């Protein structure tokens, strides 16, 4: 399929109170138009940077969004992805530990 | 997809007594590949597993690392024959194990 | 360095 | 000593709101180092070493090349759309080319294009003709074979590309050749009477790595669910592999990590 | 070590339009096995991976039984073809992947 394959992770192994970077990586999709939003408790996180768009040898596109944050126990972090292949935006929750 | 050719694109058939290099470009290289050999009975023989770090794992009847050797070159896995023998004739396949998925390259016949 | 593509 | 120089272009009709329709990016040894898009209209360094080893003449010439490619790709997108009798919608042209210096000192080169996710035209391995994957690419091939385009791109890939790749590998030796160890973390969660164990490796460099789940000392094969190697924001990489087991049975499994930065593979276990 | 034959051992040929039952007893059972099918040209097709917990993995990542059914029974993995068709003819192999090592059962010809 040409739907986005999404993965949510942190730059370092997350510890409550220590600074880190939350990454959302979407790969293997087409067409390249896509929306990827990092969310702290359903609200878009601040300081999100969208990396340059590339593709693999199979011409499928990839995009990485990342944002600096301090992981808080008692806060849910997700990634919302919208694409033409999906009939509704898809949310991918982040497993902190 | 995947094919498995002779390294030399001019070579049609392998020669006796000389080395033979088999090339295999898999669509995914983040995982290793396994070389297998099918005989004339049709039974399948595992030859060697080549890892992405080029670290090879040979069968436990250890003596292929004496005969064949697996390596990585760029984005292509390579199986080398020091001496092509009569027992080295057969159909050679590349197998890629991506998640729980097996992908087979088109076999290369090494006969005559 | 990059280089310019051909016209199709 | 495997080194690669790669350039990829994307020309879109539906890029998205506030997104450049034409984007070109370059990679040395997998690391992004140059970038051009149709909004900034200028080639820009993406690493400190490439900016620290180039003069303004370099970036001016590259920007000229990028703008010329913008115009050419606009027209090529239109032509490809019309050979398919297409008036509008989401259509994309992709280009991928470059050169590899492999560990035996040999040279490889490639230049392939795609239309709407599928192959369109490509310079073949002998670098003597162009191969059209679809009939709509046959006119282009004809034109490109009467303009001596195969030899032009052969001379680029076999020379200019390789020598500039050598220069780039010199400039970024310290960065490209560096080693960064992964921070590994084993985790476990139970649901529906199944215990999912996960092993995450963070922030490793270079990209090649192997993360295996051992059960009772034996490497598991198709039983482990891997996510592949995915990028971090800082040029490092990340991976995670899970495996399912019975409620309990936790001491049987180990995570093994093999990487260029670890003299011996790392072994990790769960600790609830 | 490992063989993988018809459950029905009197039966010589698989039949059209009906289910077809294959049993596979591997020397190691704590790891899953994969059913693969070779054509008459020799092309190799991945059919299914059956995990030790009986959780099936089908081509293109699917977990859905459209045509095939994989399961585990005692010390034998079982592959059934719901509707045996003309394109399901071929030589069926069992593959066990233990410690980066592949072990193959002798193939079984399923032909009309």
Numbering used by the authors:
A (entry chain B): 1 to 97
B (entry chain H), E (entry chain G): 8 to 119
C (entry chain C): 1 to 8
D (entry chain A): 1 to 272
Article, verbatim:
The current study determined the structures of chicken CD8/pMHC-I complexes for the first time, namely, cCD8αα/pBF2*1501 and cCD8αα/pBF2*0401, which each contain complex A and complex B in an asymmetrical unit. cCD8αα binds to pBF2*1501 and pBF2*0401 in an allele-dependent but peptide-independent manner, as demonstrated by the CD8αα-pMHC-I interaction in previous studies. Remarkably, cCD8αα binds to pBF2*1501 and pBF2*0401 in complex A of cCD8αα/pBF2*1501 and cCD8αα/pBF2*0401 in a novel “face-to-face” mode, which is distinct from the antibody-like binding mode of the known human and mouse CD8/pMHC-I complexes. Therefore, “face-to-face” binding causes the cCD8αα binding orientation to pBF2*1501 and pBF2*0401 to skew towards the α2 domain and β2m, which might facilitate larger numbers of γδ TCR to bind diverse peptides presented by limited BF2 alleles in chicken. Moreover, the “face-to-face” binding mode leads to the loss of most hydrogen bonds and salt bridges between the CD loop of BF2*1501 and BF2*0401 and cCD8αα. However, more water molecules contribute to the interaction between the CD loop of BF2*1501 and BF2*0401 and cCD8αα in complex A. Importantly, the MHC-I α3 CD loop (residues 220-228) has been proven to be key for the CD8αα-pMHC-I interaction. So, these distinct interactions between the CD loop and cCD8αα might result in the different affinity of CD8-pMHC-I interaction in two binding model. Complex B shares the same antibody-like binding mode with the known CD8/pMHC-I complexes in mammals, of which the protruding CD loop was clamped by the CDR loops of cCD8α.
Critical molecules involved in immune defense can be subject to an evolving molecular arms race with all kinds of pathogens, of which the most famous has led to the multiple loci, high allelic polymorphism and high sequence diversity of major histocompatibility complex (MHC) genes. These genes encode the classical class I and class II (aka MHC-I/II) molecules that bind antigenic peptides and present them for recognition by the T cell receptor (TCR) on T lymphocytes bearing coreceptors CD8 and CD4, respectively. TCR and CD8 cooperatively bind to the peptide-MHC-I complex (aka CD8-pMHC-I), which amplifies the peptide discrimination. The CD8 dimer exists as a glycoprotein on the T cell surface in two isoforms, CD8αα and CD8αβ. Of further interest is the fact that only the classical class I gene BF2 is expressed at a high level in chickens, and chickens can live or die based on whether pathogen peptides are bound and presented by the dominantly expressed class I molecule, intensifying the selection for appropriate CD8 binding.
